[PDB]
Amino acid sequence: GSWSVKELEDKNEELLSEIAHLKNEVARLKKLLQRCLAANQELRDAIRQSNQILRERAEELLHFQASQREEKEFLMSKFQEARKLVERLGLEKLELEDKNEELLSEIAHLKNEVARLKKLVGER
Amino acid sequence: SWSVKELEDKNEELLSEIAHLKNEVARLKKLLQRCLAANQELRDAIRQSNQILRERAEELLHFQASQREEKEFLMSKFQEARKLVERLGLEKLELEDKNEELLSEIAHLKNEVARLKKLVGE
């Protein structure tokens, strides 16, 4: 047969020792694959969260901005009506000051006239 | 004591078991390297997303710094205008009072002038 009993028993023990190594290797790789898929699950969980935060930061920024534009607009309207009031009041104060000057000019004339006339009453 | 034939057949049985376990080693090796590479792409996506996250937060912080200063400045002009409105409204009231007084002074001076012209025959 060419191979004797002793030669085949020796080969059989070599194949058994090789099965033992390959079984150990299968066990080691099953354990690495398991830990690797666990780590994959944590990274997909992390990615999703980072994205959920990105999306909420972006909507928040849009509501805040619309809110800000509404209060800036209302404050500007209050400022502009106050500034118009300043200019209107300035303009009425000036027309009134001008009237008062005419009135005082008339009063000056009327006081000169009563003086002239009182001197003439003192001489009749 | 096993015969040559029985041992040859066991030899072949052990070779088939070896061939199965070599297929299982190669299957596992390929799933693992696929999963290691998928994890490395996820860690590169996480890095990028967090960097963007950092940049937005810094841009937002300085943006709200600038908005708050613009609003404080506009509120400051409004308050100053209001102070001016109050003061000017008081000065206006005083000038209007003076106007009314002067019209009464004129009306009485005119009556007096007329009475004096009578007296002097003018």
Residue numbers in the entry:
A (entry chain B): 19 to 142
B (entry chain A): 20 to 141
Paper lines:
Inhibition of the protein-protein interaction between NEMO and IKKβ represents an attractive alternative strategy due to the crucial role of NEMO and its selective involvement in the canonical NF-κB pathway. We have previously reported the design and characterization of a coiled-coil stabilized NEMO construct encompassing the IKKβ-binding region fused to two ideal dimeric coiled-coil adaptors, at the N and C-terminus.
Mutations E56A and E57A, suggested by the Surface Entropy Reduction Server SERp29, were chosen to promote crystal lattice contacts between NEMO dimers, and as unlikely to affect IKKβ binding affinity (NEMO-EEAA). NEMO-EEAA is a homo-dimeric, irregular, parallel coiled coil of ∼175 Å in length. The regular coiled coil extends to the first two heptads of the NEMO sequence, to residue Ile65, and resumes after Phe97, encompassing the last 15 residues of the NEMO sequence and the C-terminal GCN4 adaptor. The interhelical spacing goes from an average value of 7.6 Å in the regular coiled-coil structure to a maximum of 11.5 Å for the stutter “heptad”. The most notable characteristic of the structure of NEMO (51–112) in the unbound form is a more compact packing of the two helices in the dimer, compared to the IKKβ bound structure, with an interhelical spacing reduced by up to 2.2 Å. Consequently, several of the side chains now occupy the IKKβ binding pocket. Analysis of normalized B-factors within the NEMO-EEAA structure shows increased values in residues 65–92 of chain B versus the remaining residues of the chain (all positive values, i.e. larger B-factor than average).
